[PDB]
Amino acid sequence: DKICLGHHAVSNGTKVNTLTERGVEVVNATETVERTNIPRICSKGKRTVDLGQCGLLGTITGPPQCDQFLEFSADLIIERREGSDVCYPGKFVNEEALRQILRESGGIDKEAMGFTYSGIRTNGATSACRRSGSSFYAEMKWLLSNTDNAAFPQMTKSYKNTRKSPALIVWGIHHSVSTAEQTKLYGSGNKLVTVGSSNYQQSFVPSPGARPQVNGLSGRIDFHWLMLNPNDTVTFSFNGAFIAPDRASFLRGKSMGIQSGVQVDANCEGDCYHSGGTIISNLPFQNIDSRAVGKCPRYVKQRSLLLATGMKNVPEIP
């Protein structure tokens, strides 16, 4: 009579790694490194905006592309490669910092700044900002002299943030194609624009000169921005080449922004994103994208790390 103690085993064994062995077979194992990508932006439960052709910074200035998003609200913000912040050729100073701010803003609330002008044109428009006809940035005012080559009066405009949140203020400096064009628009002589706050001080001079044609235009408007603390005031002193804001921006709350080139799905629920889609996984690691954002498993170099979920496999003696 005999009794034996034993353990189960399989012929269907899978190899794993230990401190000592490499490729030791165990009975059962599971993957710890996620590689299964969902090629969509799973947005269920999240208020989502697809800016498309509208650049994120464009939501503040307001090219035609961003007319729908001038006061948008969202939990999830999606930038697209086709997006553009600009109609009239130009770029933001410290653009990326501003993007990072807007990506988690929860959207923007616009409020008039209440600037009034006399002895001056404000109807500055261009062919690059076509909205039905020639137009301009929706939130901005292109200020000219009055007739042609006429002197631009020195002006001083101020604005106080009477709210409890910081105000996002954007202004633009216009760089004409020639000193001839600058004079035709704002008059002769050198031009200065100063922007004063209670924690900010900067200065700006235009730079007329020939540049490659972008959107048919050789002129440039570079935008500048600051955050205005509550009850603080910004003051604009200028005499030409100044793109004035009409409204200020206030951040709604909280959100997250991503850059993607794949469609959106309001059925799937996710919390970790990358340009290629959504990573939904309980696994600790992933090998899909190092720049994945949201609540994600840590990115690793390896595509596979098997965790033994069973004992060491020892085949039966036949």
């Binding site: 009794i3 103690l5 399989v10 230990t18 030791v24 710890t32 653009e95 990115y299 004992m311 039966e316």
Partner: protein, 169 residues
């Protein structure tokens, strides 16, 4: 037509448990799984799994741009920092798994020994180890007797006389 336990080979027929019993008597051969040892090993392995499922509440946001590449200097600093961190987590992941797997294997071997040592203590002086993970029982042990061993209701006092006799001569 001999039977053998652990120590050179497992049982591909033990399909209702991780650890088990295999006996042979006049009634023939039989194999049954032990619950307590199997459940212990499963509880520990599943315990590891839940531990590696515990998600992080740390949210991370974009720090660069893959449409409009950021400035070179800060961009290279960012890339250098990220690649350094990836090296760390890749290392941690590699080490974590290798460490856990070594432990999973060892705790599994531990359970096997504990079961074997338990049975050895049940049989007292009524059996001997054959060196293949089995016990040669020096008395008649029918299916009911074998079952008594599996549920720890085996009283060695009952078979001691008969066994010691057969052992000594």
């Amino acid at each position: 037509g001999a039977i053998a336990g652990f120590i050179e080979n497992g049982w591909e027929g033990l399909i209702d448990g991780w650890y088990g019993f295999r006996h042979q008597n006049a009634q023939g051969e039989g194999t049954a799984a032990d619950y307590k040892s199997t459940q212990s090993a499963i509880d520990q392995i599943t315990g590891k799994l839940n531990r590696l499922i515990e998600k992080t509440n740390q949210q991370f946001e974009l720090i660069d741009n893959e449409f409009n590449e950021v400035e070179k200097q800060i961009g290279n600093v960012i890339n250098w920092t990220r690649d350094s961190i990836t090296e760390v987590w890749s290392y941690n992941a590699e080490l974590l798994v290798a460490m856990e797997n070594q432990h999973t294997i060892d705790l599994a071997d531990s359970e096997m020994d504990k079961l074997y040592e338990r049975v050895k203590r049940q049989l007292r002086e009524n059996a001997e180890e054959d060196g293949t993970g089995c016990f040669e029982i020096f008395h008649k042990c029918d299916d009911d007797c074998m079952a008594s061993i599996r549920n720890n209701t085996y009283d060695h006092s009952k078979y001691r006389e008969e066994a010691m006799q057969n052992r000594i001569q």
